[PDB]
Amino acid sequence: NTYQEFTNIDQAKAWGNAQYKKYGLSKSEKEAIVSYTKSASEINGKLRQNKGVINGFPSNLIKQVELLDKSFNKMKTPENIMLFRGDDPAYLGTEFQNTLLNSNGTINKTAFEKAKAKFLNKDRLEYGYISTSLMNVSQFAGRPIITKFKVAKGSKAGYIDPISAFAGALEMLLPRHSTYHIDDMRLSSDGKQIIITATMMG
Protein backbone atom coordinates (compact mmCIF):
# COMPACT_ATOMS: atom_id res chain seq x y z
CA ASN A 1 0.00 0.00 0.00
CA THR A 2 0.97 3.72 0.24
CA TYR A 3 2.58 5.06 3.43
CA GLN A 4 2.20 8.74 4.41
CA GLU A 5 5.62 10.40 4.64
CA PHE A 6 5.64 13.84 6.31
CA THR A 7 7.88 16.29 4.39
CA ASN A 8 7.22 19.33 6.55
CA ILE A 9 7.83 19.81 10.29
CA ASP A 10 4.78 22.08 10.86
CA GLN A 11 2.49 19.64 9.05
CA ALA A 12 3.96 16.76 11.07
CA LYS A 13 3.39 18.68 14.33
CA ALA A 14 -0.20 19.65 13.50
CA TRP A 15 -1.18 16.10 12.58
CA GLY A 16 0.63 14.61 15.56
CA ASN A 17 -0.83 17.20 17.96
CA ALA A 18 -4.33 16.41 16.62
CA GLN A 19 -3.86 12.66 17.16
CA TYR A 20 -2.67 13.28 20.73
CA LYS A 21 -5.73 15.31 21.88
CA LYS A 22 -7.96 12.35 20.89
CA TYR A 23 -6.01 9.71 22.86
CA GLY A 24 -7.59 10.57 26.22
CA LEU A 25 -4.72 9.17 28.27
CA SER A 26 -5.24 8.70 32.01
CA LYS A 27 -3.18 10.77 34.43
CA SER A 28 -1.10 7.68 35.32
CA GLU A 29 -0.59 6.81 31.66
CA LYS A 30 0.74 10.32 30.94
CA GLU A 31 3.13 10.18 33.92
CA ALA A 32 4.50 6.82 32.71
CA ILE A 33 5.17 8.26 29.24
CA VAL A 34 6.82 11.46 30.58
CA SER A 35 9.08 9.21 32.66
CA TYR A 36 9.82 6.95 29.66
CA THR A 37 11.20 9.92 27.67
CA LYS A 38 13.53 10.74 30.62
CA SER A 39 14.82 7.19 31.08
CA ALA A 40 14.06 5.20 27.92
CA SER A 41 17.59 3.77 27.65
CA GLU A 42 17.35 2.20 31.12
CA ILE A 43 13.86 0.82 30.51
CA ASN A 44 14.61 -0.61 27.08
CA GLY A 45 17.96 -1.92 28.33
CA LYS A 46 16.26 -3.88 31.13
CA LEU A 47 13.66 -5.22 28.66
CA ARG A 48 16.39 -6.49 26.29
CA GLN A 49 18.58 -8.01 29.01
CA ASN A 50 15.60 -9.92 30.43
CA LYS A 51 13.94 -10.77 27.07
CA GLY A 52 10.69 -9.01 27.96
CA VAL A 53 10.18 -10.66 31.36
CA ILE A 54 9.37 -7.89 33.84
CA ASN A 55 8.88 -10.08 36.95
CA GLY A 56 12.23 -9.29 38.53
CA PHE A 57 11.90 -5.50 37.97
CA PRO A 58 11.23 -3.07 40.86
CA SER A 59 7.46 -2.52 41.40
CA ASN A 60 7.60 1.15 40.27
CA LEU A 61 8.98 -0.15 36.94
CA ILE A 62 6.59 -3.07 36.57
CA LYS A 63 3.85 -0.45 37.08
CA GLN A 64 5.39 1.93 34.56
CA VAL A 65 5.75 -0.80 31.89
CA GLU A 66 2.12 -1.99 32.36
CA LEU A 67 0.94 1.60 32.00
CA LEU A 68 2.92 2.19 28.80
CA ASP A 69 1.54 -1.11 27.44
CA LYS A 70 -2.03 -0.25 28.38
CA SER A 71 -1.65 3.21 26.72
CA PHE A 72 -1.55 1.59 23.25
CA ASN A 73 -5.22 0.60 23.61
CA LYS A 74 -5.88 4.34 23.11
CA MET A 75 -3.02 5.08 20.65
CA LYS A 76 -3.42 3.75 17.11
CA THR A 77 -2.39 5.44 13.86
CA PRO A 78 -5.42 6.24 11.64
CA GLU A 79 -3.43 5.65 8.45
CA ASN A 80 -0.48 3.93 6.84
CA ILE A 81 2.52 6.00 7.95
CA MET A 82 6.32 6.04 7.62
CA LEU A 83 8.26 6.48 10.84
CA PHE A 84 11.99 7.08 11.31
CA ARG A 85 14.81 6.25 13.66
CA GLY A 86 18.57 6.85 14.02
CA ASP A 87 20.88 4.12 15.39
CA ASP A 88 24.55 3.68 16.31
CA PRO A 89 26.70 0.68 15.18
CA ALA A 90 25.92 -1.62 18.19
CA TYR A 91 22.32 -1.80 16.89
CA LEU A 92 23.55 -4.31 14.26
CA GLY A 93 25.42 -6.40 16.88
CA THR A 94 28.55 -6.39 19.10
CA GLU A 95 30.62 -7.33 16.06
CA PHE A 96 29.72 -4.06 14.29
CA GLN A 97 30.55 -1.73 17.24
CA ASN A 98 34.08 -0.89 16.13
CA THR A 99 33.92 -2.17 12.50
CA LEU A 100 30.97 -0.54 10.74
CA LEU A 101 32.71 2.82 10.40
CA ASN A 102 35.89 3.67 8.49
CA SER A 103 38.33 6.29 9.90
CA ASN A 104 37.02 8.92 7.47
CA GLY A 105 33.40 8.43 8.59
CA THR A 106 32.13 6.35 5.67
CA ILE A 107 30.39 2.98 6.00
CA ASN A 108 32.90 0.18 5.54
CA LYS A 109 31.49 -1.82 2.59
CA THR A 110 32.61 -5.20 3.97
CA ALA A 111 30.78 -4.61 7.29
CA PHE A 112 27.81 -3.41 5.24
CA GLU A 113 27.90 -6.80 3.52
CA LYS A 114 27.94 -8.74 6.79
CA ALA A 115 24.98 -6.58 7.95
CA LYS A 116 22.98 -7.27 4.77
CA ALA A 117 23.70 -11.02 5.04
CA LYS A 118 22.73 -10.95 8.72
CA PHE A 119 19.53 -8.88 8.39
CA LEU A 120 18.18 -8.49 4.83
CA ASN A 121 14.78 -10.15 4.24
CA LYS A 122 14.65 -11.31 7.91
CA ASP A 123 12.35 -10.74 10.88
CA ARG A 124 13.67 -8.99 13.96
CA LEU A 125 12.17 -8.94 17.44
CA GLU A 126 12.74 -5.87 19.64
CA TYR A 127 12.19 -6.32 23.40
CA GLY A 128 12.18 -2.61 24.18
CA TYR A 129 9.75 0.06 23.10
CA ILE A 130 10.70 1.72 19.79
CA SER A 131 11.08 5.51 19.81
CA THR A 132 10.62 6.96 16.34
CA SER A 133 10.03 10.31 14.68
CA LEU A 134 7.54 11.43 12.04
CA MET A 135 10.47 12.73 9.97
CA ASN A 136 14.18 12.16 9.44
CA VAL A 137 14.94 14.89 11.92
CA SER A 138 18.33 16.49 12.48
CA GLN A 139 18.76 14.89 15.91
CA PHE A 140 20.04 11.80 14.09
CA ALA A 141 22.00 13.23 11.16
CA GLY A 142 25.14 12.17 13.04
CA ARG A 143 23.96 8.53 13.09
CA PRO A 144 25.22 5.88 10.63
CA ILE A 145 21.96 3.88 10.45
CA ILE A 146 18.56 5.27 9.47
CA THR A 147 15.52 3.01 9.58
CA LYS A 148 12.23 3.80 7.86
CA PHE A 149 9.39 1.77 9.34
CA LYS A 150 6.19 1.23 7.35
CA VAL A 151 3.43 1.17 9.96
CA ALA A 152 -0.01 0.01 8.79
CA LYS A 153 -3.30 1.75 9.52
CA GLY A 154 -4.76 0.58 12.85
CA SER A 155 -1.37 -0.45 14.27
CA LYS A 156 -0.40 0.56 17.78
CA ALA A 157 1.46 3.89 17.51
CA GLY A 158 1.22 7.08 19.57
CA TYR A 159 2.35 10.68 19.16
CA ILE A 160 3.83 11.23 22.63
CA ASP A 161 5.78 14.39 21.71
CA PRO A 162 3.49 16.92 23.48
CA ILE A 163 4.39 15.37 26.86
CA SER A 164 8.02 14.41 26.22
CA ALA A 165 10.62 16.04 28.48
CA PHE A 166 12.67 16.62 25.28
CA ALA A 167 12.01 18.85 22.24
CA GLY A 168 12.36 18.60 18.47
CA ALA A 169 11.92 14.84 17.95
CA LEU A 170 8.35 14.64 16.50
CA GLU A 171 8.24 11.52 18.67
CA MET A 172 6.01 8.55 17.87
CA LEU A 173 6.27 5.57 20.21
CA LEU A 174 5.69 1.93 19.20
CA PRO A 175 4.94 -0.92 21.60
CA ARG A 176 7.49 -3.29 23.05
CA HIS A 177 7.91 -6.84 21.76
CA SER A 178 7.32 -5.70 18.17
CA THR A 179 8.56 -7.71 15.21
CA TYR A 180 9.52 -6.02 11.97
CA HIS A 181 10.76 -7.44 8.73
CA ILE A 182 13.72 -5.72 7.06
CA ASP A 183 12.76 -5.31 3.39
CA ASP A 184 15.75 -3.28 2.04
CA MET A 185 19.26 -2.20 3.03
CA ARG A 186 21.30 0.23 0.90
CA LEU A 187 24.07 2.79 1.43
CA SER A 188 23.15 6.49 1.32
CA SER A 189 24.17 8.83 -1.54
CA ASP A 190 27.22 10.13 0.36
CA GLY A 191 28.12 6.67 1.71
CA LYS A 192 27.95 7.79 5.38
CA GLN A 193 24.76 5.90 6.36
CA ILE A 194 22.89 2.62 5.89
CA ILE A 195 19.22 3.18 5.00
CA ILE A 196 16.98 0.32 6.25
CA THR A 197 13.36 -0.03 5.10
CA ALA A 198 11.23 -2.25 7.33
CA THR A 199 7.59 -3.32 7.64
CA MET A 200 6.27 -3.21 11.19
CA MET A 201 4.23 -6.22 12.36
CA GLY A 202 2.32 -6.97 15.60
Cβ–Cβ under 8 Å, residues 172 and 190: no
Which parts of the chain are beta strand (E)? 81-87, 123-126, 130-133, 145-151, 158-159, 171-174, 178-187, 194-200
- We report the CATH number of the domain holding residue 27 as 3.90.176.10
Q: At what angle do helices 27-49 and 59-71 cross, to 10 degrees?
A: 110
Q: What are phi and psi of 64, to 5 degrees?
A: -60, -45
Name the domain count of the chain: 1
Query: What CA dihedral angle connects 59, 60, 65 and 70, to 10 degrees?
Result: 100
Neighbouring-strand partners of residue 156: 76
Which residues does the annotation mark as catalytic?
Answer: 85, 131, 171
Declared resolution, Å: 2.2
Domain span at residue 140 reads 1-202
Method: X-ray
Between the alpha carbon of residue 139 and those of residues 104, 161, 170, the distances in Å are 21, 14, 10
